[PDB]
Amino acid sequence: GYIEKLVQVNRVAKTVKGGRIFAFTALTVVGDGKGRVGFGRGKAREVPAAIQKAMEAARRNMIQVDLNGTTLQYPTKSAHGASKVYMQPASEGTGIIAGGAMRAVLEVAGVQNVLAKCYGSTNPVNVVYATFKGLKNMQPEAVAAKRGK
RNA sequence: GAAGAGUUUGAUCAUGGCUCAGAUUGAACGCUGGCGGCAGGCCUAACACAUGCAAGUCGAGCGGAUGAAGGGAGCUUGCUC
């Protein structure tokens, strides 16, 4: 995917006996416009490399999110750590109505009327985790029930 | 039919409060003002109140007060019976 969206930069420090050396981590996501989302950040010294040291793993771990076509599969109940995420599908005409790190991951999946939320912790380090566990178990038909409905 | 930021730390994560975007009113206040239409205008002292006005109506319900006119009598057109 080439439809990358930057999530957050955050100015990391750590201390040597000489003094404080600073480093930048920056998480970005990568999607294909049809639903293969990826994750990752990089540890470097500088801004323009830590977003492509994010691409170092963002093209990795890409998994085809099982869409329906422009609309999400279900009302969602999901969590990682101390972040919890609610989602439900919308109908036709509303655009991006998620927030912060939720508009990055749910816009590269091909769905546009998203209506996603954040509960518990709001840390974007652990926020993007609960969003993909919200999208990892999507199935309209892939249940093993011996019935189409 | 539901958007979050900033802020504890050398940095992190979590629990957790603060401050912020918004929309609002019977509005004030600081500013500066061209007009129309519909509106709304003691939120406080149910505090004291000058002044005028806010419910008088009826004579075809009844007694009783006053005499429009007009037609005449005298004096002679002033006056009254």
Side-chain angles (χ1 to χ4, degrees), chain A residues 1-19 21-149:
Chain A
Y2 287 159
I3 316 298
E4 59 92 24
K5 290 186 186 294
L6 178 59
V7 173
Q8 196 200 16
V9 292
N10 50 2
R11 190 260 184 90
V12 181
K14 77 280 200 187
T15 308
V16 181
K17 80 278 193 186
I21 175 171
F22 302 110
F24 289 94
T25 63
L27 193 148
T28 197
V29 299
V30 163
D32 55 354
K34 196 259 290 180
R36 294 185 69 88
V37 300
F39 289 146
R41 74 188 72 185
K43 185 257 175 65
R45 276 84 166 88
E46 67 273 20
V47 174
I51 51 171
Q52 271 82 23
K53 285 180 73 172
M55 300 298 175
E56 187 177 3
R59 282 88 57 87
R60 300 177 71 189
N61 299 318
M62 287 174 69
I63 298 298
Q64 178 68 48
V65 179
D66 301 330
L67 268 291
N68 201 1
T70 316
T71 307
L72 198 64
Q73 282 298 126
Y74 44 72
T76 313
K77 185 178 288 291
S78 295
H80 188 277
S83 294
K84 290 181 279 291
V85 169
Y86 190 79
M87 300 174 190
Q88 80 272 27
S91 296
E92 177 64 29
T94 309
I96 300 298
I97 46 177
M102 278 77 176
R103 71 189 72 189
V105 57
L106 263 290
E107 191 178 4
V108 302
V111 61
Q112 55 87 30
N113 46 5
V114 286
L115 218 161
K117 299 161 205 61
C118 185
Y119 292 99
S121 180
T122 323
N123 189 11
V125 171
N126 203 3
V127 149
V128 299
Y129 291 167
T131 60
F132 178 57
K133 269 83 78 174
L135 304 179
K136 198 181 289 181
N137 303 117
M138 288 170 66
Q139 52 188 359
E141 194 268 330
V143 295
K146 54 195 75 171
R147 177 69 183 88
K149 185 68 174 177

